[PDB]
Nucleic acid binder design. Structure first.
Lengths: 76, 48, 59, 126
RNA sequence: GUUACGGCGGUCCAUAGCGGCAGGGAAACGCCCGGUCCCAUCCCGAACCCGGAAGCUAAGCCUGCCAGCGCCGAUGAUACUACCCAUCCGGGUGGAAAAGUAGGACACCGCCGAACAC
RNA sequence: GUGUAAGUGCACAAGGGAGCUUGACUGCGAGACGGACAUGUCGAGCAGGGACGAAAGUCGGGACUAGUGAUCCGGCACCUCU
RNA sequence: AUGGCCGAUGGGCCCCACAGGGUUACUGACGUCAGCCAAACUCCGAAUGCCGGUAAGUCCAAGAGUGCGGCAGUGAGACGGCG
């Protein structure tokens, strides 16, 4: 009976801690809300987390949920 | 079944919007209010 | 201090990291020697390829 | 050996108010130029503060405890209206123009609506 | 600046919780009285909302003390593992758990507001 | 318990109930994910005109991931094209 | 899953009523003092690997990367070491 499988969806974290990003850049691709949006981070229709403002990705925890935030790196 | 049906405007009568619905749950012709581009306002859209 | 590093085993069959560490040290053939100061980077390099080189302390 | 069987109505009311205030704090937060006007209402008084959440301070505060607003012979709605005017031009003195109204987990009506429109008509638009 | 005080927030949100014992109502926090008014019940002024302060800290609240239940948690050792030796057994350098133990812990910090002296 | 398989989540509810409503919009879209190519996916924000709300605000279908078929050919409606 | 303990439930037996019942070589639910197991279990949880930043090294060379264009071949692999 077996032999049917689905194509890999390439989920996971796309930008890791310390990486600088531009506005609208996808941070993580996830099914559930494993990482919750933090400051300057939005949530997509498919729970995709994207940056709302440029800066450095910073992974943090809030009230027991792992969250993703954007640190507003200092202008030169 | 949920067949594809078309909703036309009332003033200019252009069959703009389409969607599906159950023909047995709502056998009567649907009535909904939507945005019509060329007229630029919100008027009801009637079934065809 | 200073470290006296000489190659004693060939690079045949060695992994990519070992070949690149040997090149980074600055030696290419057998019996070739280099003198490098004693820092953490050098210790890491020699630790990568300790089975291919011999390390003497200069002086 | 006098152990009440269940929760007192005061505990239920306090927990419900805190929970449904926290549920509305999801969308409501205050900044430096847009602070949060949080109102706490009791059966005898009402209190309002201007909170900047990103740092955790209170730019301005008003309540019914002070004797100046105690002196008005008016009803509780009148006291709330006076408190709203007081918080309004205290915020005026604080350099704050636009605010967000945190209702503190109560229904928007009666005294809370009263001081809400009191602050609104005093020039604090929100 | 001080009080067994009231709010708004925090912290890789329990080291904070749960439980026991002993207290208090200055302003406050409440319980409480009533449904005339705004408002409400998928029935009920129970809840929500509104008007008051006769009574009460018995509860909520917070204060102090308990390691009791939970919670946090080393060091060492070990499992495991990267590289390198090693004809199998195993060994060398580096990393290093989980469980358990010693122990910690009956929270800490910030901004306003009450009452008090200045 | 989440309409539906399992997984990831959701008690702060995405679970349960009520009121109004049709954004199950039009023109767009910085920047990205994934990819031989064709496909596919997320998207802040701008304008029009709306829904809900006192307001801030949210709404370009449904907690997310399946429910679908390129090209050619032909039908229907509109167009200030020929 | 147990050292499988008690323990449901049904059946027979004994009373005989068939109602009411009790006795197990009966059948014997789940649990649990303690010990177990798990690729489709995880309150935990490494070593490597991977993404990024930084400081160096090689640097008369790796004859290194990336973009564009010209010309290809390859798209039946084998053994050995680890999972």
């Amino acid at each position: 009976r077996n032999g049917r499988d689905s194509a890999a969806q390439r989920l996971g974290v796309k930008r890791f801690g310390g990486q600088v990003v531009k506005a609208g850049e996808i941070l993580v691709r996830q099914r559930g809300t494993h990482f919750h949006p933090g400051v300057n981070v939005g949530r997509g229709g498919d729970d995709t987390l994207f940056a709302l403002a440029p800066g450095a990705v910073e992974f943090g925890a809030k009230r027991g949920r792992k969250t993703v935030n954007i640190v507003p790196v200092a202008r030169p | 079944v949920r067949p594809k049906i078309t909703l036309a405007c009332e003033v200019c009568k252009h069959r703009n919007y389409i969607t599906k619905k159950n023909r047995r749950n709502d056998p009567d012709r649907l009535e909904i209010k939507k945005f019509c581009p060329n007229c630029g306002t919100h008027q009801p859209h009637k079934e065809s | 201090a200073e470290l006296k590093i000489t190659q004693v085993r060939s690079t045949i069959g060695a992994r990519w990291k070992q070949r690149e560490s040997l090149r980074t040290l600055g030696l290419k053939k057998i019996r070739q020697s280099v003198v490098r100061e004693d820092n953490a980077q050098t210790r890491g390099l020699i630790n990568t390829v300790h089975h291919l080189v011999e390390v003497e302390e200069v002086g | 050996a006098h152990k009440p069987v269940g929760q007192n109505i005061s505990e239920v009311r306090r927990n419900a108010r805190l929970r449904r205030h926290a549920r509305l704090r999801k969308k409501v937060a205050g900044t430096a130029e847009v602070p949060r006007l949080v109102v706490n209402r009791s059966a005898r008084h009402i209190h309002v503060q201007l909170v900047n959440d990103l740092n955790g301070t209170t730019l301005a505060a008003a309540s019914s405890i002070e004797a100046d607003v105690r002196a008005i012979d008016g009803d509780k709605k009148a006291h709330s209206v006076r408190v709203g005017q007081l918080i309004a031009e205290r915020a005026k003195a604080a350099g704050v123009e636009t605010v967000v109204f945190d209702r503190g987990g109560y229904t928007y009506g009666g005294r809370i609506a009263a001081l809400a429109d009191a602050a609104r008509e005093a020039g604090l638009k929100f």
